[PDB]
Amino acid sequence: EFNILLATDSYKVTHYKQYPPNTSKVYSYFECREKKVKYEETVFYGLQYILNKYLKGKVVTKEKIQEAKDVYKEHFQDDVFNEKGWNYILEKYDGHLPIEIKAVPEGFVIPRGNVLFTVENTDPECYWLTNWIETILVQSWYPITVATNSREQKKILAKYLLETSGNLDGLEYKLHDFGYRGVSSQETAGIGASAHLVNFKGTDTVAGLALIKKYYGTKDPVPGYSVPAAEHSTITAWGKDHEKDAFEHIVTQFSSVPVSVVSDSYDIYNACEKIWGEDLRHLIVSRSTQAPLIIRPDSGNPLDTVLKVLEILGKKFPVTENSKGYKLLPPYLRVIQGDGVDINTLQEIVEGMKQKMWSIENIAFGSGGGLLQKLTRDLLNCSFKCSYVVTNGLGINVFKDPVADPNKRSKKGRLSLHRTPAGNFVTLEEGKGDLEEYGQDLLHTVFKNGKVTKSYSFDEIRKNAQLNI
Amino acid sequence: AEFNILLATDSYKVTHYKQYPPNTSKVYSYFECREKKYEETVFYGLQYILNKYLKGKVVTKEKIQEAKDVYKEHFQDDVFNEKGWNYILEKYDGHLPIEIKAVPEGFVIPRGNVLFTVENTDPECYWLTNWIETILVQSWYPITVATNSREQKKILAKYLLETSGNLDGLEYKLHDFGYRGVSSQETAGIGASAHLVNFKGTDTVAGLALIKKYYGTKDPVPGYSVPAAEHSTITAWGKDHEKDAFEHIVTQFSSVPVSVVSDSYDIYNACEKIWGEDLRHLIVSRSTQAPLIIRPDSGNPLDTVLKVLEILGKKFPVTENSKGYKLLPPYLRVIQGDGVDINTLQEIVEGMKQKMWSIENIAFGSGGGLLQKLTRDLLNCSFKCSYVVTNGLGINVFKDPVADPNKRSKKGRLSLHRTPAGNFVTLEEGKGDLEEYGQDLLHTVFKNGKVTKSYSFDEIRKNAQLNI
Ligand SMILES: O=C(Nc1ccc(CN2C(=O)c3ccccc3C2=O)cc1)N1CC(c2cccnc2)C1
Numbered sequence: 001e002f003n004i005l006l007a008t009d010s011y012k013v014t015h016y017k018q019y020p021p022n023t024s025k026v027y028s029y030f031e032c033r034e035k036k037v038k039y040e041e042t043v044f045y046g047l048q049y050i051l052n053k054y055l056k057g058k059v060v061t062k063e064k065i066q067e068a069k070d071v072y073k074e075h076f077q078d079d080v081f082n083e084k085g086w087n088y089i090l091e092k093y094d095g096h097l098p099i100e101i102k103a104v105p106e107g108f109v110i111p112r113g114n115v116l117f118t119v120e121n122t123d124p125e126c127y128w129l130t131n132w133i134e135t136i137l138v139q140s141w142y143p144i145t146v147a148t149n150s151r152e153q154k155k156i157l158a159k160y161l162l163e164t165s166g167n168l169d170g171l172e173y174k175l176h177d178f179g180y181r182g183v184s185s186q187e188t189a190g191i192g193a194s195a196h197l198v199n200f201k202g203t204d205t206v207a208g209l210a211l212i213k214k215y216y217g218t219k220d221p222v223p224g225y226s227v228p229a230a231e232h233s234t235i236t237a238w239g240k241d242h243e244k245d246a247f248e249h250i251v252t253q254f255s256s257v258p259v260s261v262v263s264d265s266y267d268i269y270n271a272c273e274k275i276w277g278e279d280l281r282h283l284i285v286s287r288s289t290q291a292p293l294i295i296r297p298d299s300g301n302p303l304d305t306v307l308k309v310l311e312i313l314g315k316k317f318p319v320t321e322n323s324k325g326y327k328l329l330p331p332y333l334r335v336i337q338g339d340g341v342d343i344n345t346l347q348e349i350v351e352g353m354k355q356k357m358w359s360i361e362n363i364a365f366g367s368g369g370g371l372l373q374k375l376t377r378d379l380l381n382c383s384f385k386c387s388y389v390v391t392n393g394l395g396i397n398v399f400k401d402p403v404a405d406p407n408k409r410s411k412k413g414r415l416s417l418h419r420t421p422a423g424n425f426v427t428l429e430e431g432k433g434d435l436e437e438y439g440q441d442l443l444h445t446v447f448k449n450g451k452v453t454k455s456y457s458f459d460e461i462r463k464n465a466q467l468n469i
Numbered sequence: 470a471e472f473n474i475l476l477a478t479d480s481y482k483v484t485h486y487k488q489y490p491p492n493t494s495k496v497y498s499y500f501e502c503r504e505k506k507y508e509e510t511v512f513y514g515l516q517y518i519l520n521k522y523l524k525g526k527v528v529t530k531e532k533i534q535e536a537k538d539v540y541k542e543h544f545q546d547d548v549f550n551e552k553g554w555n556y557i558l559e560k561y562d563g564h565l566p567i568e569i570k571a572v573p574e575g576f577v578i579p580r581g582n583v584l585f586t587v588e589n590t591d592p593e594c595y596w597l598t599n600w601i602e603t604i605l606v607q608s609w610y611p612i613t614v615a616t617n618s619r620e621q622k623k624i625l626a627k628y629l630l631e632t633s634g635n636l637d638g639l640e641y642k643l644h645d646f647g648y649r650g651v652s653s654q655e656t657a658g659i660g661a662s663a664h665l666v667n668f669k670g671t672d673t674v675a676g677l678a679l680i681k682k683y684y685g686t687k688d689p690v691p692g693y694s695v696p697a698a699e700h701s702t703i704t705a706w707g708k709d710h711e712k713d714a715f716e717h718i719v720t721q722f723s724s725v726p727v728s729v730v731s732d733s734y735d736i737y738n739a740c741e742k743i744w745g746e747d748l749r750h751l752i753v754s755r756s757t758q759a760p761l762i763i764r765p766d767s768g769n770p771l772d773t774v775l776k777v778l779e780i781l782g783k784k785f786p787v788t789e790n791s792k793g794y795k796l797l798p799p800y801l802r803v804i805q806g807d808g809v810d811i812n813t814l815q816e817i818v819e820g821m822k823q824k825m826w827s828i829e830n831i832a833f834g835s836g837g838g839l840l841q842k843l844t845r846d847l848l849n850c851s852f853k854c855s856y857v858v859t860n861g862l863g864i865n866v867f868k869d870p871v872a873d874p875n876k877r878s879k880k881g882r883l884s885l886h887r888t889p890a891g892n893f894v895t896l897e898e899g900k901g902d903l904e905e906y907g908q909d910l911l912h913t914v915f916k917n918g919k920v921t922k923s924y925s926f927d928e929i930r931k932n933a934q935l936n937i
């Protein structure tokens with residue numbers, strides 16, 4: 001059972017005693033601060049999950065106040081917990097948070113250094129609450145960063161797909177999520193997988209399917225799809241001497257559907273030349289355009305291994321030249337590179353495939369740790385700061401401006417996001433957005449006093465995150 | 470809501486029951502942190518997985534139907550082992566017929582060593598062993614956080630010993646600041662608890678409830694914190710009232726330690742004029758157990774610490790300890806909470822020693838470097854099948870990639886032993902049965918939906934202790 005009173009940074013428990021006396025409003029905002037992947041624009045995704053899972057409804061109970069008071073007395077070796085403040089929310093509001101959250105629509109692709117969401121207390125007694133929930137809200141850095149980095153990889157794949165083949169067919173099935181085991185927790189898996197599924201349709205991280213269904217919803221049967229595939233265990237269990245029988249049984253069991261057969265168990269080059277290219281060739285050439293064999297190398301240099309595999313297949317199977325002049329394997333034969341794949345190495349493989357005249361139609365990518373784990377809050381400088389305060393009737397525009405780091409400077413006053421006359425975005429500071437020079441604020445109220453006031457379907461998120469191309 | 474184990478694996482594993490050789494009755498697999506710094510790994514976090522996701526009735530009629538409906542759409546085919554999960558529900562009342570043996574939690578084991586093993590206790594459930602690989606491999610995260618945190622405790626102990634002569638207050642030298650910098654609420658709890666195996670200082674409150682619930686301590690809480698300011702509690706006063714904010718906060722926390730972030734506008738100015746002159750009288754009057762902890766939070770981490778220490782040393786009396794290292798007065802300390810990871814901490818303790826500053830003067834706060842900037846590939850944490858039983862024959866199975874010899878896995882039934890010299894060794898091919906030296910260090914922790922052996926967090930802390 002989750003308790004919002006124990007889901008903050010410990011020092012925030014002490015902050016109610018630190019603000020200027022008679023503070024009635026603490027108003028804060030979140031941005032991906034500005035500074036070969038630059039990440040100049042970000043997909044805004046994941047807040048709806050946090051609003052629903054942690055912030056809406058009766059989140060304050062007498063049992064939760066008692067739990068927090070007893071924990072923090074031991075944790076601080078001092079009584080410094082705001083029992084009165086939390087009891088006030090319980091009595092006046094039936095444990096519903098007197099907070100208002102305004103955000104940019106989910107799936108929206110916004111350039112760096114723009115307000116993405118704002119937080120403020122609706123009750124003067126709860127000026128301290130705005131920054132209590134900073135910690136839980138700042139964790140939206142993760143779904144944002146996964147969705148942005150995955151979108152950046154989609155631009156790479158889309159460039160090389162159109163370059164080498166003239167179409168963008170099956171782009172949505174070119175980057176497969178292999179990350180379930182490589183993430184820090186079961187919860188991160190669902191969050192991360194769901195963020196990737198904003199840009200792609202292929203996933204092995206089953207957790208992401210239920211998260212979308214519960215917090216976003218879709219008109220579609222499933223948010224994501226997978227194909228039957230082998231692991232080293234289902235190959236090696238047959239014995240070193242029976243790597244052929246493993247391959248033979250697997251391709252026969254899944255003959256009406258595409259099947260990924262890991263082929264590096266002992267010798268990848270030997271598996272492609274002797275097993276697939278000769279001994280089981282009659283089981284390959286017969287396969288459907290809707291049911292191809294997907295060969296999977298899983299070791300060695302990703303670009304080197306990819307090229308050696310493809311040419312072996314070029315000798316043993318008929319390779320056709322396409323409209324652009326790029327080599328194309330038969331429709332029943334494809335490849336998956338599911339090892340050492342991140343945004344950088346993905347770029348190096350597709351560039352190499354282009355340089356050796358191979359079409360990107362021939363391959364798909366499998367990314368785990370690089371896709372959902374090897375990402376930090378600093379990649380996009382995801383940050384939550386106080387920009388405005390009301391103390392004893394006087395509103396003041398506040399910000400930090402550290403001398404040794406001007407990139408750490410934050411925005412001032414009440415903020416708003418606007419569509420510019422040239423179809424771009426601008427963040428207005430100091431409440432200038434009230435004048436509506438560039439029309440209405442693009443932030444909408446998504447949360448107000450314990451209630452989710454605006455929700456997005458995963459379908460409109462997907463439409464919003466589409467590549468301009 | 471509610472967790473469903475049938476929905477808690479990599480999609481392809483749903484298809485493996487149809488891939489294993491005909492008449493397979495046992496699939497035996499193991500976990501290790503493969504070799505080729507991190508020479509020794511802290512085993513921690515498996516008990517959390519066992520209790521939370523694997524023990525008891527983890528299979529229900531509703532959960533089978535939930536999985537079946539999903540996979541039908543997910544795969545565009547009815548490839549799901551409904552009959553196999555139904556068997557577990559009927560025969561074992563939804564309890565997992567599995568046996569997990571693991572090295573005790575807190576143990577410090579070198580790389581390329583069996584940490585835990587999994588095998589099915591029913592021949593109809595040969596497929597179950599690797600179904601749960603995905604859930605078990607996630608133990609990489611508490612192992613890596615506990616290991617990387619212990620490595621930092623090693624650096625801190627060495628440098629604190631060379632500059633002060635003692636290891637006093639070591640457990641409070643690396644404070645967890647990672648709550649906001651992690652991927653989820655669950656990761657925060659797991660990660661914070663893993664740092665707490667080595668230290669006692671945390672701001673990631675989620676770690677306490679995990680330890681209380683899954684491990685337990687003699688002490689009321691495993692982790693402690695101090696009141697501290699943030700940029701918003703400073704800046705809310707206005708740019709011209711930084712002295713007023715400071716005065717207020719140090720007066721409110723007059724008799725307890727207090728961390729005050731001082732780089733809102735100008736760190737050096739805040740040190741030299743505000744703390745150094747104007748509010749100096751409010752600092753020199755403080756108790757040794759209630760000091761002012763100055764927090765810089767931007768600029769080059771080493772250059773900023775050295776310049777801060779230089780300014781404080783010109784405004785407050787600095788002494789030379791028994792080691793001949795510069796010591797600040799007991800009512801004044803520093804916390805470097807920005808840009809701290811294993812590499813930068815090392816550079817900062819190095820830089821201070823070279824500028825004759827004692828490490829008694831500083832503590833570190835680490836967020837993303839401590840709990841987020843870590844991957845499964847750091848310690849090469851992997852789950853591999855080493856042994857199978859097919860048509861009554863038991864055979865040793867392994868992977869040996871032609872282009873990567875590091876990726877070669879162990880063969881057959883494994884066991885972890887200690888030589889009389891003290892070093893660990895993994896017996897392959899069932900050689901453990903020859904009881905060549907002592908007992909197997911792997912003890913049954915899980916068997917048939919039941920958690921068979923448990924460790925307290927105090928036990929884990931003892932097993933995890935530094936050599937010195
Ligand atoms: O390779 C896979 N899956 C797999 C491979 C390729 C594709 C992409 N794709 C299609 O959808 C498709 C449809 C029709 C024709 C061609 C194709 C195609 O090429 C999808 C999944 N694995 C799951 C497994 C894994 C999971 C976790 C960790 N480590 C390993 C290894």
Ligand SMILES: O=C(Nc1ccc(CN2C(=O)c3ccccc3C2=O)cc1)N1CC(c2cccnc2)C1
Binds near residue numbers: 647672836
């Ligand atoms: O600085 C802190 N805490 C803090 C400061 C110093 C210490 C170390 N320490 C002691 O325990 C102690 C006891 C007695 C005397 C001296 C000391 C001392 O020096 C621990 C925590 N912050 C919490 C906050 C933050 C920022 C970002 C993210 N998450 C949280 C900023």
